[PDB]
């Protein structure tokens, strides 16, 4: 174990560079407030003493715009209906929840939204009746591809007036793709007599039309859903009130933090203006990167707590909420611990069926590639997303290869003999810093886009290699000590 004093020094350095970079980004935003306001409209509110919120982000300004109008009221109605069903008719709770989900989808997306969800569900079920996993995967891929077609997009836009309902329908269908694909694959793999009647059409309708995750919520494993819908054990509503109170308090705190950190610094406006990235100093570049990844983390905390809170009230166990990205230090850790539900779906339904490590390293590579391909194609399959997927697969493959190489008994014995485990920890932290220096760039490409990632690569690494790259590596080195030191808690 490392001595406590120098680990505390590493934590101090990590917090110091986070906070100084945040201050630099705040200064840059304040000194460039007028031109950014002129180019992109900035929302004016009295929540923070007159500071102007940066509404350039799409997911935040879309989900809060929907929540203030329809989503929060419908989610509260779902909570009330679930509690009433648990109190009065516990046996028929899944069907009541399914009916409420259909009614909520109708009232929020018109008849076409419900009709399209039903069509996708029915087609997936009819195809899965053949009990072939490959045919089911092609059916799911075709159903997902029907979203990206220009003609279908034009028809769907003609369906709706506000043009935000079309985006809501697209997101709902994209999530439904995963949900009915998971159910269909589970039906294909079902060979147990006890579970023969669990995979029926009404159960598929109940699984698909679950309101908390109808639109954006995390992928809920069908095994857990079917297990919890049939417990017939009450949740002691007196404790459910306390659970709701604590969840609401935490969600309000998270939302306030997200609003504060969007108000103080205009991350999205700065990334939208590529010419401003070249002008601002390297400290501002690092601060923008850290603030952007942290804001994505906080935004998805807010956007996943509400489905998680609704599940916890419903008795379900939700997938674990994202861990703080300032803890993350490697590609595998980021994938395992950030988006738990989608990672579990990819492992169970995309990674394993193609074939995991059982086919050897080369086969593993293919499997990983396939998984990554799908997730990129799931998010839209844009060019920047494909570049992010390629870079991310390269990172994961390099991590796995190095871990396999170092864990060989001969090399492990040699490194144990040469130096103490303290030196091994220091070298592992330096390596993980060199890895996270590219992990953050890949995530910036995912968030900022191709231009933002290229600008970061040029300025941080190519243009300023002699001292800027070394300083970034050292700061991420202390950061990696902190991350690895905390990683033992959840290892």
């Amino acid at each position, epitope marked *: 174990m490392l001595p406590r004093w120098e680990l505390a020094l590493y934590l101090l350095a990590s917090l110091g560079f986070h906070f100084y970079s945040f201050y630099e980004v705040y200064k840059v935003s304040r000194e460039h407030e007028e031109e950014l306001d002129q180019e992109f409209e900035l929302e004016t509110d009295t929540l923070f003493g007159g500071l102007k919120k940066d509404a350039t982000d799409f997911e935040w300004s879309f989900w809060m715009e929907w929540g203030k109008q329809w989503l929060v009221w419908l989610l509260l109605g779902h909570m009330v209906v679930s509690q009433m069903a648990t109190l009065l008719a516990r046996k028929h709770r899944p069907w009541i929840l399914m009916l409420y989900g259909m009614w909520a989808c109708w009232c929020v997306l018109g008849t076409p939204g419900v009709a399209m969800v039903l069509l996708h569900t029915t087609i997936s079920f009819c195809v899965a009746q053949f*009990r072939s*996993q490959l045919l089911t995967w092609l059916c799911s891929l075709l159903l997902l591809s029907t979203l990206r077609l220009q003609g279908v997009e034009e028809v769907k836009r003609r369906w709706y007036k506000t043009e935000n309902e079309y985006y809501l329908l697209q997101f709902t269908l994209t999530v439904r793709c995963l949900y009915y694909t998971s159910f269909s694959l589970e039906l*294909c*793999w*079902q*060979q*147990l*007599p*006890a579970a*023969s*009647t*669990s995979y029926s059409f009404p159960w598929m309708l109940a699984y698909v039309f679950y309101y908390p995750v109808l639109h954006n919520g995390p992928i809920l494993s069908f095994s857990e859903f079917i297990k919890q819908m*049939q417990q*017939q054990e009450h949740d002691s509503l007196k404790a459910s009130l306390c659970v709701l109170a604590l969840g609401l308090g935490r969600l309000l705190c998270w939302w306030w933090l997200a609003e504060l950190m969007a108000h103080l610094m205009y991350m999205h406006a700065i990334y939208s203006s590529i010419p401003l990235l070249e002008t601002v100093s390297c400290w501002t570049l690092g601060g923008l990167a850290l603030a952007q990844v942290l804001f994505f983390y906080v935004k998805y905390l807010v956007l996943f707590g509400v489905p998680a809170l609704l599940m916890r009230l419903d008795g379900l166990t939700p997938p674990a909420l994202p861990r703080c990205v300032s803890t993350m230090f490697s590609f595998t850790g980021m994938w395992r611990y950030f988006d738990v539900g989608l990672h579990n779906f990819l492992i169970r339904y995309v990674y*394993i*069926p193609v074939g995991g490590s059982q086919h050897g390293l080369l086969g593993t590579l293919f499997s990983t590639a396939m998984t990554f391909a799908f997730v990129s194609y799931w998010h839209g399959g844009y060019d920047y997303l494909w570049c992010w997927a390629a870079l991310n697969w390269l990172g994961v493959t390099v991590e796995n290869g190095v871990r396999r190489l170092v864990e060989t008994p001969c090399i492990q014995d040699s490194l144990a003999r040469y130096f103490s485990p303290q030196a091994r920890r220091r070298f592992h932290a330096a390596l993980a810093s060199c890895s996270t220096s590219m992990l953050i760039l890949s995530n910036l490409v995912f968030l900022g886009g191709n231009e933002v990632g290229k600008t970061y690569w040029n300025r941080i690494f190519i243009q300023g290699w002699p001292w800027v790259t070394l300083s970034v590596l050292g700061f991420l080195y202390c950061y990696s000590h902190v991350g690895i030191a905390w990683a033992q808690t959840y290892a």
Partner: antibody
Amino acid sequence: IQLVQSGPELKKPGETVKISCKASGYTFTNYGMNWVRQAPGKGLKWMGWINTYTGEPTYADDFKGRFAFSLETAYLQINNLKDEDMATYFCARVWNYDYYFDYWGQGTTLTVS
Amino acid sequence: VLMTQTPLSLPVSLGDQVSISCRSSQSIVHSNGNTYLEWYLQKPGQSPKLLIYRVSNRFSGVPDRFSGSGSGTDFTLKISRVEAEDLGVYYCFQGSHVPWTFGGGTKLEIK
């Protein structure tokens, strides 16, 4: 539809043995496979099962840490470390609905002494 | 789940009705709304054969005289007329609660 097993097997207490269950007359991956054992002085004990479609075995709590189910798709093998157990091992096809075991193997009597 | 059988050894002469009771430790009714309790006849020196799959149901091989009716916890199997070819060991098996457990075994003998 029939299931045929390897045959009698004699092994030393320290060694290990593999028992094969070959299924014919039906789509092998359609139905899972159940491995049970019958001790000379006891009744049937359900050791575990293997999902032929995905190859994911689930074992009973008692029969864990030493037994492993593998595929050869249409034989299906079991591996274990030898010990005082000398039970006769049965292989059973499991039907999709309403009942568990329909067709059984002959059973490979195992002698470990 | 521990499942016991009464009687352990049941001697009946040829052509006489026989009743075998299987008592479970707890409820066998699965969450699906049905109970998976089935009865296996293992003749000496071979593998068991299924007789009734769900309560009061009958397999294709079993003749009409193997009707067995049971409650939620205590189940029973009845042979109206023993044809002297039904001798063997009868095991009651539950599939609802993992791990799946067989019965002790009710050996039949000619008195």
